[PDB]
Design a protein around this ligand. Structure first.
Ligand SMILES: Fc1ccc(Oc2ncc3c(NC4CCOCC4)n[nH]c3n2)c(F)c1
Length: 341
């Protein structure tokens, strides 16, 4: 049966939610912290803003719901609930998404300081465990950074936000964790972009400092190539962008630096893993599954406790539909939702 809904204005927006959700408080569509009286969980409730205003927006709403409904893993943000106050498809215009409330993000944890090697092991282990799962469903995060890695008091981690030009401009953390092939659109990229991001994050946990804090795209590329070396003939061929390939060749060649001299005092196993993650040629980067079996994670690794995902049908991604068609599909997904045990 349909629960009773009550109304409240919070972010100059009217939130209409089931009675079970109490003490709604803004934290950041708009997001509110709340207490789910049915489960006893502290939750985050996200109300999507104008979910069906255009074809692009309607498809994005469907995409986010499909992604969240699929993810069922300890280290990945999943759906506790999804609801609409609408009683029918014709009334349907708002979507609310509910997940676990996490206390902080990784930026709050690092706070300009070094973490202990054990803390780094545990945090990177969980990220990679979550990524193995996400990647196994043929999903790419594409935008991994400390701000979308949420953590509780016990350092337990979940991945958020998986799946404009102005905000990528300049001295900005929005670009610092991006693989060079996507920052400069070198080629058709794949899952390996996420491993680059993990490398950048891991380095920052170890040193307390941004690995590649570029002041712009070009400055960042220079910082990258100084560490990992300029591309060889092999990688150059794979840069399908003739323009990008042409620019790359104009740069003075540089050898790969010694990572042990860059990361002074770090666990030699951490240095080794960083060398395997921060490879310029994406074809040759370590995968999440391979990284989990690396000696650095010896105390956490368990091949029987690192699950993969059920098949994820994303044929909708190459489909062209009307607004009302994406809207109907979204409605079907809301109505059919089954809460976790
Ligand atoms: F179903 C969802 C999916 C993602 C959502 O977005 C979101 N945003 C944020 C959080 C959060 N905590 C953040 C962590 C970073 O600092 C601010 C609070 N815990 N859970 C969260 N979920 C959401 F609210 C509902």
């Amino acid at each position: 049966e349909r629960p009773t809904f009550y109304r409240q204005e919070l972010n100059k927006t009217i939130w209409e939610v089931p009675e079970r959700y109490q003490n709604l408080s803004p934290v950041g569509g708009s997001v509110c912290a709340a207490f789910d009286t049915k489960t006893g969980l502290r939750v985050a409730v996200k109300k999507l803003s104008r979910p069906f205003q255009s074809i692009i927006h309607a498809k994005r709403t469907y995409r986010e719901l499909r992604l969240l409904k699929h993810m069922k893993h300890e280290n990945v943000i999943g759906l506790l609930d999804v609801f609409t106050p609408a009683r029918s498809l014709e009334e349907f215009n708002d979507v609310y998404l509910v997940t676990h409330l996490m206390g902080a993000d990784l930026n709050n944890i690092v706070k300009c300081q070094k973490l202990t090697d054990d803390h780094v092991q545990f945090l990177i282990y969980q990220i990679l465990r979550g990524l193995k799962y996400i990647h196994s469903a043929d999903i790419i995060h594409r935008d991994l950074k400390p701000s979308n890695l949420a953590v509780n008091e016990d350092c337990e981690l979940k991945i958020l936000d998986f799946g404009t030009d102005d905000e990528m401009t300049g001295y900005v953390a929005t670009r610092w964790y991006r693989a060079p092939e996507i920052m400069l659109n070198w080629m058709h990229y794949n899952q390996t972009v996420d491993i680059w991001s993990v490398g950048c994050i891991m380095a920052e946990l170890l040193t307390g400092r941004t690995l590649f804090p570029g002041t712009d795209h070009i400055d960042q590329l220079k910082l990258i190539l100084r560490l990992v070396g300029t591309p060889g003939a092999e990688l150059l061929k794979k840069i399908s962008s003739e323009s990008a390939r042409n620019y790359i060749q104009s740069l003075t060649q540089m050898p790969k630096m010694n990572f042990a001299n860059v990361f002074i005092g770090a666990n030699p196993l951490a240095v080794d893993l960083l060398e395997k993650m921060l490879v310029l040629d994406s074809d040759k980067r370590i995968t999440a599954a391979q990284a989990l079996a690396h000696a650095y994670f010896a105390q956490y690794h368990d091949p029987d406790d690192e699950p993969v995902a059920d098949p994820y049908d994303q044929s909708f991604e190459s489909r062209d539909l009307l607004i009302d068609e994406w809207k109907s599909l979204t409605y079907d997904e809301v109505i059919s939702f089954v809460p976790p045990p």
